[PDB]
A paper describes a structure:
Consistent with the recent evidence, Lpg1621 exclusively processed the K63-linked Ub2, while Lpg2529 showed activity against K6-, K11-, K33-, K48-, and K63- linked Ub2. Based on the sequence analysis, we identified the conserved catalytic triad for both LotB (D27, C29, and H270) and LotC (D17, C24, and H304). While LotC retained its activity with the predicted OTU domain (7–310), LotB lost its activity after deletion of 50 amino acids (300–350) located at the C-terminus, beyond the predicted OTU domain (11–283). LotC lacks this S1’ site, causing the VME group between two ubiquitin moieties to be unable to reach the catalytic cysteine. In comparison, the helical lobes in LotB and LotC contain 183 and 210 amino acids, respectively. For LotC, we identified several hydrophobic interactions of the extended helical region (Tyr119 and Tyr149) with ubiquitin (Ile44). During the simulation, the C-terminus of ubiquitin (Arg72 and Arg74) formed transient electrostatic interactions with LotC (Glu153 and Glu245). Remarkably, a single mutation on E153 completely abolished the catalytic activity, which indicates that the electrostatic interactions are essential for the correct docking of the ubiquitin C-terminus into the catalytic pocket of LotC. The NEDD8, which has an alanine instead of Arg72 in ubiquitin, showed no modification toward LotC. By contrast, most of the enriched proteins from the inactive LotC pull-down were non-membrane-bound organelle- and ribosome-related proteins (RPS8, RPLP2, RPS27, RPLP1, and RPL13).
Author numbering:
A (entry chain A), B (entry chain B): 16 to 63, 66 to 180, 186 to 254, 260 to 278, 283 to 302
The structure:
Amino acid sequence: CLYYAYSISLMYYLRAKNNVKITEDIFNKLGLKEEDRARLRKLLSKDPAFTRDEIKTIIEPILGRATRDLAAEHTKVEFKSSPHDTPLFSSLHYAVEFGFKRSLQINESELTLLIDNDFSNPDYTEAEIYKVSGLLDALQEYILTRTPSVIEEFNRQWENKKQSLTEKEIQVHQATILDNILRKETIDFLLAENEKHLDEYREHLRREFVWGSEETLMVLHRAIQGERMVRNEPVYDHEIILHVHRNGASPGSPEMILNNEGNVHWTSIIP
Amino acid sequence: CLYYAYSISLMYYLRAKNNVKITEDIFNKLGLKEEDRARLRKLLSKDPAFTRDEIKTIIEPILGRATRDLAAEHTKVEFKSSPHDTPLFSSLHYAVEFGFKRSLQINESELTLLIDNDFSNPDYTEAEIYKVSGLLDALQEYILTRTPSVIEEFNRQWENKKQSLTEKEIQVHQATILDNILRKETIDFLLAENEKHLDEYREHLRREFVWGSEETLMVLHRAIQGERMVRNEPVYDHEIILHVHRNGASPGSPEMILNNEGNVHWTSIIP
Ligand SMILES: [Pt+2]
Ligand SMILES: [Pt+2]
Ligand SMILES: [Pt+2]
Ligand SMILES: [Pt+2]
Ligand SMILES: [Pt+2]
Ligand SMILES: [Pt+2]
Ligand SMILES: [Pt+2]
Ligand SMILES: [Pt+2]
Ligand SMILES: [Pt+2]
Ligand SMILES: [Pt+2]
């Protein structure tokens, strides 16, 4: 139950700092309407311990939605900033590399023998991008109608590369060249049509059935702290030490604490 | 290079999970003094790899020695729990079965013709127990002077089980009776004098010239996870998915990775 627990824990940190500047700045990052910013600041006074009623009627409806949207949207911007580092890349790429292996051999090409991929690796099996509605079907379509050009592009690139000839150090190079090509297929698929599939993923993560992962938590908390990299250098807006606990275990002193119960139950814990 | 690589892999796993108690439990299994537990604790911070200086002045001296010791003592513990299952049994028994063929021939007994053993079988020729200092010498002595009693014991058991006359099924039954006797010889020789030769193997495994086998790897990892069978039921203390890569190849998601380069060089791999 991540965004709820994040929200609750974020309210304890605000009421604890008693600063309208940090409070207002973070309200801004969540883009909250001033009507809602009033309901929350009422809670920031009267310190003791938030009621079940303050949570169900004030914190959950306002900061639940807003933190999920901030996590969603900030997933997108991290991807655009440096896409090969993101989980979404390597998850989607693992699928693109598996579809192309199947479509390459269907197209009677020797390039299939360069992909070792069974689409069963547990690191990728449950990636949320695979549950985006219609996405994988559009991925199959994309892999089919793009495979002739891919083979073309591999042939082109291979012939430029020729120069010993180990007959196993020369399938190194087929593999690497093909991997770079497919890594570009992965990003292009997401960036097509002013980021149609990328926005499709954003909307999926704004859906309420989608469990926030520990992955999305870290995006959220970087968005909340406003962590950036800007020309002049990495700049922050707040430093908020966060600690995750796992099945009660514990790991500077932390200002926000969540307990992660085997990735099923999120609870926040007041420091 | 196994204990070093196991140790490195164990610190990546530790640092990654960030639980004081999982950490402290495993330090307990490794029986480390609080002095050394602290030098490691420093290393499990500022995770956002480890330097060669951290490895060779901190991780290797502390965990290298402790994991070897743990692997060794736990070799002994498994043997005592169920000795015929351990490879130490199967290797020592193959030697004992070969020495007894030689000694029974020397004592001009027809029993030597029931033993099928050239001592050449490669599965057993490289057995670490054979390299234990003095051990095979003590074994010959033991076999030479125990042989009259063994002939004695085979004759006794043979008389008792006589009940017919299949011949094709007479060498069978002599063979089996003798094999059981020799298997008891094998264990006795190790448990004699309060487990003197068994402890001599333990100390051999502790001497740092002894290359960690792949077999010893799995003992250590069962000890680290505190695997046991207890009467309430086989119960664990941790589950730590380990994976071995073999000459770079790959096999749920793994928390420790070692690469085993054809049993000459061990390296760990951050997941
Ligand atoms: Pt939630
Ligand atoms: Pt994390
Ligand atoms: Pt992170
Ligand atoms: Pt973090
Ligand atoms: Pt940067
Ligand atoms: Pt080693
Ligand atoms: Pt192994
Ligand atoms: Pt094993
Ligand atoms: Pt058992
Ligand atoms: Pt294993």
